[PDB]
Amino acid sequence: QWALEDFEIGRPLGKGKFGNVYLAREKQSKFILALKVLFKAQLEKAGVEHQLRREVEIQSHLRHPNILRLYGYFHDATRVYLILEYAPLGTVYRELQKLSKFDEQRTATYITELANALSYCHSKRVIHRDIKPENLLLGSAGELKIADFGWSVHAPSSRRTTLAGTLDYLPPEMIEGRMHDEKVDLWSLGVLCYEFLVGKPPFEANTYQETYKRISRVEFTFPDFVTEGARDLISRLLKHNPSQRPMLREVLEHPWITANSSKPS
Ligand SMILES: Nc1ncnc2c1ncn2[C@@H]1O[C@H](COP(=O)(O)OP(=O)(O)O)[C@@H](O)[C@H]1O
Ligand SMILES: CSc1nsc(SC)c1CO
Ligand SMILES: [Cl-]
Ligand SMILES: [Cl-]
Numbered sequence: 001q002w003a004l005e006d007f008e009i010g011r012p013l014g015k016g017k018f019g020n021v022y023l024a025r026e027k028q029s030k031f032i033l034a035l036k037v038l039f040k041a042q043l044e045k046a047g048v049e050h051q052l053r054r055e056v057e058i059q060s061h062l063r064h065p066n067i068l069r070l071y072g073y074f075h076d077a078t079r080v081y082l083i084l085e086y087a088p089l090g091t092v093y094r095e096l097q098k099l100s101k102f103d104e105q106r107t108a109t110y111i112t113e114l115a116n117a118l119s120y121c122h123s124k125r126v127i128h129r130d131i132k133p134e135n136l137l138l139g140s141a142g143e144l145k146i147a148d149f150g151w152s153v154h155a156p157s158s159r160r161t162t163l164a165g166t167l168d169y170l171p172p173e174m175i176e177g178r179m180h181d182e183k184v185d186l187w188s189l190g191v192l193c194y195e196f197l198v199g200k201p202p203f204e205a206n207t208y209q210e211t212y213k214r215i216s217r218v219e220f221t222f223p224d225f226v227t228e229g230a231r232d233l234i235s236r237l238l239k240h241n242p243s244q245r246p247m248l249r250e251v252l253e254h255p256w257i258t259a260n261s262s263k264p265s
């Protein structure tokens with residue numbers, strides 16, 4: 001169906017490890033979208049064909065206001081192209097670098113939108129496993145949308161692929177190569193809530209080896225300005241044992257969330 005000739009390409013929207021993402025417009029309809037370009041040589045060399053297929057399969061079937069749409073794909077012997085919904089206000093990562101820290105209302109609103117999207121995912125036994133600020137995009141009304149489903153799977157799971165970059169958002173069971181389930185995304189939700197309020201993630205460290213140590217031991221502390229309600233939510237989410245982490249309904253119902261968020265369940 002679709003080919004490169006059907007699109008006019010515009011400015012770079014971002015770069016990932018494999019992803020080179022561009023603004024584009026479809027010629028006949030003038031429909032604006034994001035084109036995610038991957039190089040087949042790099043996909044083959046790293047052996048991550050299966051991840052890309054999972055990304056297309058999982059993300060194209062999901063339909064939720066807080067999850068980014070994937071419309072389709074095509075390829076041309078050197079490259080693969082994913083056709084994505086365009087997120088005009090950019091990444092949460094960028095917003096955090098701009099403002100340094102988010103206030104309690106902004107943070108609780110983002111956490112509510114995340115928990116809604118994740119609740120929808122988990123009801124189909126889909127786990128994302130790569131929730132972090134560079135994979136959270138912002139819609140035209142500033143609403144949060146989860147993206148980059150390349151690491152997503154069905155539960156329960158092991159890990160068959162090498163961990164690439166940062167350990168900062170991964171729970172103990174994942175970095176220790178053990179078995180995991182849905183609760184991995186709840187740990188990440190805890191890490192994000194802390195990073196939003198404080199400006200850096202709770203286990204951050206100068207080396208891989210030391211970050212690993214802080215995560216496995218769950219060593220983190222709070223700055224004085226973090227309030228009692230935020231501390232209670234974060235401490236419940238960052239439990240070493242997965243089964244002790246709250247259910248998403250509990251997060252959505254938590255008193256600090258209900259007091260500060262400006263969106264509903
Ligand atoms: N739909 C989109 N709208 C706007 N920017 C995007 C979109 N998709 C990706 N980006 C930008 O490109 C970056 C990489 O996209 P991503 O899908 O996360 O690639 P990778 O799989 O390589 O991480 C994002 O971190 C973001 O900065
Ligand atoms: C989802 S289409 C897809 N995934 S991986 C690869 S490797 C070339 C392709 C193209 O056939
Ligand atoms: Cl497995
Ligand atoms: Cl894997």
Ligand SMILES: [Mg+2]
Pocket residue numbers: 016134135148
């Ligand atoms: Mg990404």
Ligand SMILES: [Mg+2]
Pocket residue numbers: 016019148149150151
């Ligand atoms: Mg990816």
